[PDB]
């Protein structure tokens, strides 16, 4: 005969959905990493031998929590900064003089308030063509008939830094270490950790930057791959560099909408008039895109696949809409999707609406000219269209949650069920 016996602390876990917190390394920043608890010095990797666990990168909640964290992280940091609402005055934009007639920036003058309803000033600025819309000459900001506009503080740095995502006690996160895991399904060589690795929040389009590289062979991940309306994330087994620059020596005017509200506009270009651009190695891209074409052919009955630019997306979808050392770039990617280097024509906009929100309008202060960013293409973001006997893959974006799924694909949260009940021949007393 047998009797029930209580075992406390048995390796049993349930599902997910808890409250994850932040973690940062040794150290001002934007992502509130000062309030992030210090990341433990050495991590705690330990393999769960004989354990096969079912993952689901597209139904993960760490992404939905991070995507909500990043959105909430921006609004909390935008409150005390200067709002450019009084900057919606009539802009008497003209033009910036060049030497070559074969624009991108305009010279706009306007009135603003100085000391409240008293004397005003007639000051000028240099706004990009994308930041301005004519009302026909006459001009105004692109987002004033939409909703409120506000400027981010220059005292903050929106550059991506490692953000370790931890689970509290009584919970854990599982880590799939199989090199060829296609994002969903079972996985072996599973390990357990308390915090994720150094995940940098990179917001880009069509190209994944500074992400974790794939190992062994190239990896592809999607949902219903037969469904063309579902987005496709591509991993990179060999990285492709990309150096993007803005070769203009901008100036930073400090005009005052007193009291305290000081708006920093673009002063005057000192030097030559050049255009922003992204340098990618054509010999590296033509071979790397050829190896993605190989893995693409494996997921289809030997169907030759074509690449083409975007369809009808906005400026943030049809172009590699990423961010460098301050300014926001929009590189026309019709060249890569059709032995030396390739160069893209990148535009710059200052008043953007990130995450495609209603009510949001940020202003990126001008950087003091000659900005250079060294990046690393570690992924892609493709879509498909329709349903003849060839396949066309176009770059897409839209939802920024896919950016966080590309790094949180191998993580799922699990709680702990320490209670263990099992029978063994063991009794007690009266």
């Amino acid at each position: 005969n047998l009797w029930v016996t209580v075992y406390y602390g048995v390796p049993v876990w349930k599902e997910a959905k808890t409250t994850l917190f932040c973690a940062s390394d040794a150290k001002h920043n934007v992502w509130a990493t000062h309030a992030c608890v210090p990341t433990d010095p050495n991590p705690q990797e330990m393999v769960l031998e004989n354990v096969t666990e079912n993952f689901n990168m597209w139904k993960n909640d760490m992404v939905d929590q991070m995507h909500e964290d990043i959105i909430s992280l921006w609004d909390q940091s935008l409150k005390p900064c200067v709002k450019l609402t009084p900057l919606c005055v009539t802009l008497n934009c003209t033009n910036v003089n060049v030497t070559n007639t074969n624009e991108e920036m305009k010279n706009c003058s306007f009135n603003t308030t100085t000391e409240i309803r008293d004397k005003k000033q007639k000051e000028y600025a240099l706004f990009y063509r994308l930041d301005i819309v004519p009302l026909n000459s006459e001009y105004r900001l692109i987002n004033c008939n939409t909703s409120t506009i506000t400027q981010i503080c220059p005292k903050v740095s929106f550059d991506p830094i490692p953000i370790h995502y931890c689970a509290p006690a009584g919970y854990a996160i599982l880590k799939c270490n199989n090199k060829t895991f296609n994002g969903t399904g079972p996985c072996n060589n599973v390990s357990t950790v308390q915090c994720t690795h150094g995940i940098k929040p990179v917001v880009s389009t069509q190209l994944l930057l500074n992400g974790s590289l794939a190992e062994e062979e190239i990896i592809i991940r999607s949902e219903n791959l037969t469904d063309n309306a579902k987005t496709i994330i591509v991993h990179l087994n060999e990285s492709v560099e990309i150096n993007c620059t803005r070769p203009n020596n901008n100036t930073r005017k400090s005009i005052r909408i007193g009291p305290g509200q000081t708006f920093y506009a673009t002063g005057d270009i000192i030097g030559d008039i050049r255009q922003a651009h992204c340098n990618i190695s054509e010999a590296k891209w033509n071979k790397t895109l050829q190896r993605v074409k190989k893995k693409l052919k494996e997921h289809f009955p030997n169907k030759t696949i074509k690449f083409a630019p975007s369809s009808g997306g906005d400026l943030e979808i049809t172009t590699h809409s990423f961010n460098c050392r301050g300014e926001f770039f929009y590189c026309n990617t019709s060249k890569l999707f059709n032995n030396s280097t390739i160069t893209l024509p990148c535009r710059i906009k200052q008043i953007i609406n990130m995450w495609q929100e209603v009510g949001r309008a940020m202003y990126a202060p001008p950087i003091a000219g000659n900005i250079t960013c060294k990046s690393n293409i570690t992924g892609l973001l493709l879509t498909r269209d329709g349903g003849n006997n060839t396949e066309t893959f176009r770059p897409g974006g839209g939802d920024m949650r896919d950016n966080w799924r590309s790094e949180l694909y191998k993580y799922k949260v699990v709680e702990i069920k320490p209670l263990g009940i099992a029978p063994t021949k063991c009794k007690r007393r009266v």
Partner: protein, 219 residues
Amino acid sequence: QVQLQESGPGLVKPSETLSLTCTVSGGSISNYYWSWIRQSPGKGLEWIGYISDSESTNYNPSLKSRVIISVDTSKNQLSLKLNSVTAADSAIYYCARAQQGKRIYGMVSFGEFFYYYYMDVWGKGTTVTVSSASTKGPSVFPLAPSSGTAALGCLVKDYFPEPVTVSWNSGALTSGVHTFPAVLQSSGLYSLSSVVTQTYICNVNHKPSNTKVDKKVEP
């Protein structure tokens, strides 16, 4: 290698067409750019225009409404025309060989360059005067010497307009020739001199009036 020669009238009444030709020798006209420049008394240099090897012109914005530059590819001759002339257009007109210059500061794909033009081979330039006054041949008189060394001269009295090419013994006598600058008398004419410190012959070529006259000097 390349030689130039500005063959012009020398004096044209106001409100007329100004003909002027510049002949080349060792250089072809369908290969390089050619620019005309004028320099006014009391003013600076006025770049007028230029023509390309493709025979296309571009004029200075101040006088774009007048200047017309042509090309005669039969010979090496190139000409210009300037209508509605006034007393302010009288100056020295130069002929120069212009070279194209591409200054690239960025990448050629996004443009980021500009074309600058420089002239390295110039001409002597011809004199042009604008006045309703007529032309007059000069009066040549011989300045006789008198008794270390000595010197004799050749007076040129009352002509219009500038200039007058002066020679001695028809280019033979070279050293010692000292042709002085003329003077604008109150009557409105110029009068220069020439002195040289076997007989001597004074050579006065007055092309604006075509009057060539030769005279000798002997006490």
